[PDB]
Amino acid sequence: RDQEQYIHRKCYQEFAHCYLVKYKTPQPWPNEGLIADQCPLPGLADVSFYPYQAIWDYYAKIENIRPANWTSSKLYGKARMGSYYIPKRLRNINNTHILFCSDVLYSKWYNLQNSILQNENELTKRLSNLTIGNKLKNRALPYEWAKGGLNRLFRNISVLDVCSRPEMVLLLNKTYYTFSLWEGDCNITRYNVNETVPECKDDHPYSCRLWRYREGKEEVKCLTSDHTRCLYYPEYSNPEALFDFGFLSYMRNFPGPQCIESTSIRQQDYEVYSIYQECKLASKTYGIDSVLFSLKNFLNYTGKPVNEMPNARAFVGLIDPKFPPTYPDD
Ligand SMILES: *[C@@H]1O[C@H](CO)[C@@H](O[C@@H]2O[C@H](CO)[C@@H](O[C@@H]3O[C@H](CO[C@H]4O[C@H](CO[C@H]5O[C@H](CO)[C@@H](O)[C@H](O)[C@@H]5O[C@H]5O[C@H](CO)[C@@H](O)[C@H](O)[C@@H]5O)[C@@H](O)[C@H](O[C@H]5O[C@H](CO)[C@@H](O)[C@H](O)[C@@H]5O)[C@@H]4O)[C@@H](O)[C@H](O[C@H]4O[C@H](CO)[C@@H](O)[C@H](O)[C@@H]4O[C@H]4O[C@H](CO)[C@@H](O)[C@H](O)[C@@H]4O[C@H]4O[C@H](CO)[C@@H](O)[C@H](O)[C@@H]4O)[C@@H]3O)[C@H](O)[C@H]2NC(C)=O)[C@H](O)[C@H]1NC(C)=O
Ligand SMILES: *[C@@H]1O[C@H](CO)[C@@H](O[C@@H]2O[C@H](CO)[C@@H](O[C@@H]3O[C@H](CO)[C@@H](O)[C@H](O)[C@@H]3O)[C@H](O)[C@H]2NC(C)=O)[C@H](O)[C@H]1NC(C)=O
Ligand SMILES: *[C@@H]1O[C@H](CO)[C@@H](O[C@@H]2O[C@H](CO)[C@@H](O[C@@H]3O[C@H](CO)[C@@H](O)[C@H](O)[C@@H]3O)[C@H](O)[C@H]2NC(C)=O)[C@H](O)[C@H]1NC(C)=O
Ligand SMILES: *[C@@H]1O[C@H](CO)[C@@H](O[C@@H]2O[C@H](CO)[C@@H](O[C@@H]3O[C@H](CO)[C@@H](O)[C@H](O)[C@@H]3O)[C@H](O)[C@H]2NC(C)=O)[C@H](O)[C@H]1NC(C)=O
Ligand SMILES: *[C@@H]1O[C@H](CO)[C@@H](O[C@@H]2O[C@H](CO)[C@@H](O)[C@H](O)[C@H]2NC(C)=O)[C@H](O)[C@H]1NC(C)=O
Ligand SMILES: *[C@@H]1O[C@H](CO)[C@@H](O)[C@H](O)[C@H]1NC(C)=O
């Protein structure tokens, strides 16, 4: 009978937006610190005027009370306080692949105003028209991922993505771009702002000023004998007062300084395989049930199922996975 529809339905409901990205070589995120001023911060006492930003999971939050001989490096490595600390598990040299199940990276053909029927149909059509086996043609990808890219399935990643999808950016960005209003970045100080920024000849109170000024060396001062409760002094100024300065500056709400520097993270072409296309292909040989079982287990490669992870966060690193998985000969 026309088995095709059952295989489509099952493969789609389990693996539609699941993909496997192979780095040319294992190259992890290179710094412990992430400078992303474009994301709003929680602000004073966390009474936040913005919805929860996922990147806040990695926020190096300044605390006023610290023990007597406390340094930021004890908790956040080389990261700046008030920026973000990338934990070791998100910059792991051993990780050769990135597995994700998310629709946030589809280009404009996919848009949630349409009926789900349209989007389902269009995605399966495009995948069939864009795959050699289970491997995507380079034209499906961003050119930044693979030479020949024409965004025919995936969009380019953006500056604001890191705020809602930090793991995706950390694991998949070919290049790290800073967005900074910190004093000293790009040799911009509180003294030469009227000279480095063209449009400043000296209105929003945020105009032509920096966000974080360097106040001095980081230190802990103890004014009691109680050395467990001492006062912390950050190196740069505290951003709670001006919690959305960087975001508002990124939206070009006012003129002023902006520092953007690039760092090449991963070189050479990505390869990308569609788990859905592999489901549909292997089903005609080994049967839908075993293909389903084996690819579900592959999605559980780390003990946490990637497709049971939130759509914005379902991006995981893998160490030398066998793909396709062995299919049971039953
Ligand atoms: C994960 O990966 C993601 C994907 O890889 C990644 O997303 C990408 O991030 C990067 C970095 O953020 C993005 O690239 C940036 O794009 C910026 C914006 O580009 C547009 O706007 C600028 C400015 O536009 C002004 O001028 C035009 C005319 O020129 C006007 O039409 C505008 O209206 C505007 O005019 C004024 O008005 C605005 C308010 O309305 C003001 O805000 C504005 O500042 C003006 O005052 C244009 O220049 C751009 O033109 C480009 O157009 C296309 C591409 O769009 C190209 O074909 C073309 O060649 C132009 O590049 C565009 O329209 C850019 O500003 C930004 O450029 C800076 O960074 C790069 C990389 O380092 C530099 O090479 C570049 O020269 C710029 O660096 C200078 O400026 C920065 C600060 O901006 C300094 O820190 C730096 O030191 C340097 O200064 C030196 O040079 C200056 C000359 O520029 C000089 O003046 C200085 O004095 C100094 O000597 C950069 O290109 C990219 O778009 C993202 N991609 C996507 C798909 O989103 C993501 O970030 C990654 N995430 C993480 C976490 O890593
Ligand atoms: C990249 O992979 C290597 C190899 O898997 C990782 O090194 C290994 O790290 C584990 C802990 O994550 C070590 O296991 C421990 O070994 C001690 C013996 O000293 C044992 O008593 C513990 O119960 C535990 O099993 C393992 O020794 C270590 N192996 C080597 C060769 O270094 C490495 O950490 C990975 N890198 C990253 C950044 O994750
Ligand atoms: C996603 O990112 C890529 C960059 O890797 C963008 O590709 C670039 O797109 C621009 C405009 O579409 C191309 O420039 C144009 O070239 C033609 C040549 O005929 C010229 O007539 C135009 O005036 C303009 O200069 C550029 O070549 C192209 N670069 C590459 C490497 O393909 C792409 O547009 C981005 N898409 C989105 C939606 O952000
Ligand atoms: C993805 O793989 C992980 C294995 O890394 C699976 O976790 C396993 O989940 C089962 C279900 O509860 C656990 O079995 C039970 O464990 C308890 C306590 O250890 C034991 O007393 C019971 O007799 C029973 O065997 C199992 O321990 C656990 N394994 C680990 C290492 O945590 C997970 O279920 C898999 N997810 C999917 C969707 O398949
Ligand atoms: C999708 O399939 C079409 C087949 O129609 C591929 O090529 C298109 O061919 C028609 C003529 O039949 C041209 O008019 C189109 O311009 C072609 N498409 C493009 C995008 O140029 C197409 O390459 C396949 N891939 C995608 C991503 O659509
Ligand atoms: C900042 O100054 C240093 C030298 O002190 C120089 O190497 C660097 O390129 C400068 N950066 C910018 C953005 O001007």
Residue numbers in the entry: 218 to 419, 427 to 554
Cite, word for word, the article reporting this structure.
The FV envelope (Env) glycoprotein belongs to a class I fusogens, which are synthesized as single-chain precursors that fold into trimers, and whose protomers are subsequently cleaved in the Golgi compartment during transport to the cell surface. FV Env is cleaved at two sites by cellular furin during maturation, giving rise to 3 fragments: the leader peptide (LP), the surface (SU) subunit, which includes the receptor-binding domain (RBD), and the transmembrane subunit (TM), which harbors the fusion machinery. In this manuscript we present the X-ray structure of the RBD from a zoonotic gorilla FV at 2.57 Å resolution, which reveals a novel fold. We identified, within the RBD, two subdomains in terms of their structure, conservation, and function: the upper subdomain, which encompasses most of the genotype-specific region, and a more conserved, lower subdomain, important for binding to the attachment factor HS.
